[PDB]
Amino acid sequence: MIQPQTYLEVADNTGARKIMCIRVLKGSNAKYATVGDVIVASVKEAIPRGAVKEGDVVKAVVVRTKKEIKRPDGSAIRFDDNAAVIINNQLEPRGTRVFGPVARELREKGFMKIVSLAPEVL
């Protein structure tokens, strides 16, 4: 459950360590973003010499939320952080690796390359 001002761990090797959501790209006025949704974020913290650097305004898809997400089979799944993967306008990773598990919901929403690159899909 991500909203503007929410911080996200970035789960890739783009160089960004932390991003702060400034908009959830899902209609006229979405209040929250969840797994599989795209947000616009400010890069609040990075490591030297990445693709991305502190101050950049980037797009990312959320892959892990601390608020548990519910599934049609009656189950739910929740993570220890809120994480995201930085993308281009084509919904593709800007980096070449993704770290930590990701939500299976990503697959349904055409983030196949990220699902693949993930070490685990839960």
Added chain:
Amino acid sequence: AKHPVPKKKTSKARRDARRSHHALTPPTLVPCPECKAMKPPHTVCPECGYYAGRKVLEV
């Protein structure tokens, strides 16, 4: 607030119209089947001390 106040004195008619609901309802009473005295139902009779056939209480 800014201290509301009656704008006009209430007429004898209007004050008495207000009170058209103020009449007391008389106490509802039933005979005690033992001493035939009048008392409220579902109460131990305060004159003989009987309720539900038996002596319960010292009057």
Added chain:
Amino acid sequence: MRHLKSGRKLNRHSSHRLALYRNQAKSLLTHGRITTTVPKAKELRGFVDHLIHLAKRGDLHARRLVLRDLQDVKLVRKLFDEIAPRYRDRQGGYTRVLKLAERRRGDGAPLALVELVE
């Protein structure tokens, strides 16, 4: 709202209301009959019924349970040795409540008696 909530509040905070029932329990087990306001009375029934029921168990654990509310060793001895036996065959309902016909002068409160059954 109050939807399906059990238990009167009796305009006392949590610990006062507790003390209220305990003290009424002591008085009831002591004198066999007390007079109170109707609401306190209906509310006393269950609280005391449970205490009697444990005295029908008779065992150590139950005595130590009752002592938490009643606090008085002698009164509990009376509970176990004299009171509880009267109810060996009785299946609950060891207390009755009957409303008196006159209200308190100073506040008009309706009164009732709470006594132990025979």
Added chain:
Amino acid sequence: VDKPPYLPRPRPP
């Protein structure tokens, strides 16, 4: 829009 007030903002008696 920022016109000047016409009443002094009330003092107590």
Added chain:
Amino acid sequence: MKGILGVKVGMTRIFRDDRAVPVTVILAGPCPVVQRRTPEKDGYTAVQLGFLPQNPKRVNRPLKGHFAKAGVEPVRILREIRDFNPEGDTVTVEIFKPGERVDVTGTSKGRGFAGVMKRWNFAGGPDSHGAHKIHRHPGSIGNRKTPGRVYKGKKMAGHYGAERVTVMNLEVVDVIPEENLLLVKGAVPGPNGGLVIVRETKKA
């Protein structure tokens, strides 16, 4: 049009095709027809249904007369279904097969005197920054000298719920005729034990 009386019994989820589906369970049958409203006699078309058997010790004489002219045991509830006229003397859950969509009517839970926030979802007041005993108040209720009054229908605090509510187009998940049971997907107005009406949906 077709319908039945019933009582709301409670809620669960069952499993169907690896999906958890929330259901309210309704005891609908059996409802005997006790009167038929006819256009010659009444001016419209309906069926008066009876529901839940009653102790005849509690049924007065004018009521007893009504039942007897129908040759029907005394029942607790009478209610009509409009423009519905079953061939039989008795209406049961079997008029609904799983997959059908229905309209359920019940009596909403009663919130008694409800504040303007609970009732009309008002934003209330601020909780700090100087807010003065208006944290749950509704704000302004009007203009000034024009119109110098408050509109009819102004949302204000007052009673809420305990009123007729209908929620529409609910899936019939299953029906268990041997227990007079209906399984409806989703939420149904009112408390467990509440009387509800189940009608064939009006949506397409």
Added chain:
Amino acid sequence: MNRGALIKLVESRYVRTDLPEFRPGDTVRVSYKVKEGNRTRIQDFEGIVIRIRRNGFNTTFTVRKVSYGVGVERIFPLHSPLIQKIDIVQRGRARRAKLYFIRNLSDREIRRKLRADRKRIDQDRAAERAA
């Protein structure tokens, strides 16, 4: 009318009776039916059950596991048909019913706090001896 029995009656068809008993503190491997387009397979989820909230057919249990450097909690319905099996992998001894506290604990501190429940372990191996 018994509204409680009716519900139990509705539920009764969907009830599972074939799962092992476990407690908060036990370490469990849940084999869960998963769909991944367009086939369906069994993915295993193994961790400590930190919660069991009971409501008859609607009881559910929460399992916690650390996956590739991140904490993952999964909530399962105890009678879900998407559970193939559950394998007890270890019996842990809790002293409370809900073990949320293990979230702020290191893997070392958890280890100290959730001793092997030797009793129920022996019980497991006490059975597991069938004619």
Added chain:
RNA sequence: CGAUGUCGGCUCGUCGCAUCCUGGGGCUGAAGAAGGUCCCAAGGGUUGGGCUGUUCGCCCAUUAAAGCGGCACGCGAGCUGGGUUCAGAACGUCGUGAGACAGUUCGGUCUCUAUCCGCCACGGGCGCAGGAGGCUUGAGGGGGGCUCUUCCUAGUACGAGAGGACCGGAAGGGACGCACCUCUGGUUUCCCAGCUGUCCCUCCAGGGGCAUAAGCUGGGUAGCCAUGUGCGGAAGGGAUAACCGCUGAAAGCAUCUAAGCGGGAAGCCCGCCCCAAGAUGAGGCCUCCCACGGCAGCCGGUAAGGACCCGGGAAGACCACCCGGUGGAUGGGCCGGGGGUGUAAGCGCCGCGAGGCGUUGAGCCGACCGGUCCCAAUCGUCCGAGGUCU
């Protein structure tokens, strides 16, 4: 001027339409797509942030769009009090001075009780020509009315290419609304356990008070809830707006019009959901009582029925509503289940000891689902038709 409180914000709307979006059009220097420009349209919608007291404005990120105005520049007996009109103090400036400045700066008392109208809820009374218990018709009101993306048709029509449809069809959203609590997630003032200090019971062990109106801490049922779940906007019919026609004169041609007839909007009427016969125009149907005793009236006892009183209630401020009142499961006990807590006390064994182990998923245990006449709803009372006239 024997007072009409004054900017901005917040809250709550409501109206206009010179329309920001969505809907329908004509013209285009309209190939397609996308625009321009005017017309019809007020049903709905019209985002979140940075700056400033700001309205306004610029800016960031989005959007179908980020409309403009009225309502005492709507709304301080609704809130705020940042701006601005007091008293303090300072800067620049003006003044010999006291002081002053559409120049600036920091600070600075915003009043528990609503009589009437109006509004939101809820009752009491009387009426609806016999008196009554039910079930209803719906005059007339209110509610709602939004919209985006992707896919298919089809990389087709159109274009050199880039680009890319109409019509029709299918899926998934955002915001809102109504209900709901199975799930997710909250609370759960005593439902369970752990812990400290102190005082106490009874020395140990075991417990109670207090540390908040729970001492603290970890949990937590029902309820009430949203972050959770179901469902809604329609469909459809009718009549229209701009606009397009058919047939067609006056006026041998032409003309949507003068006779007549079609097509045509998110708009209008109906349809959906809710209120509603005080609809005094007081409606309708089913059933029940009945022809009383004394001089359209009166007094009196009754009938069908009602009320009082009582046990209660996901009903509720009181009132009302609903269920029950011993030919009874209404509440309280008790019992069984659920549920919470997480293995009581006592004892036995082990350890010098704090402890640990077994008995034991034990003991305790609100509300949830039921059973059970053990306790209480004892016993009763008072109202309550005799039907006006053509």
Added chain:
RNA sequence: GAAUGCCGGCAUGAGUAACGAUAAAGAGGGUGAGAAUCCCUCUCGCCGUAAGCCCAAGGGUUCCUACGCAAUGGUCGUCAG
């Protein structure tokens, strides 16, 4: 007949706001025409660098006892400064 006139009397608001720290109550016994409110007992709770005790100001019989309850006491009163 008016002077927000003066003095007095009586209305309206109204059976309304309130009844002065949220430290807190319950029962049994007694007295009496009358008791939630006075006396006694038991249970409960509050202060305890005080809400206990002793001085000095100031107050001036308020002290003790009997007999009273019209008024005073924010209710009651059999009690009381």
Added chain:
RNA sequence: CGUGAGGGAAAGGUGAAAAGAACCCCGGGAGGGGAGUGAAAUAGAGCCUGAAACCGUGGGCUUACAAGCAGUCACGGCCCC
């Protein structure tokens, strides 16, 4: 009332005569009802006269589909002389 200088009220009437109501009755008392006194007791001490606002009890007329500075003019109904 004010520390003080100082400010500064309200408050008359039984009857000729107390003959100021023995005694009985309800009541804890207050109060009243009889008896009694008096020319008179709604002259009974809360006392000559006893206006008005104000509060009440009984009776006549009237009022629950109606729009108002409350009256006025007309007509009809009902009650009274």
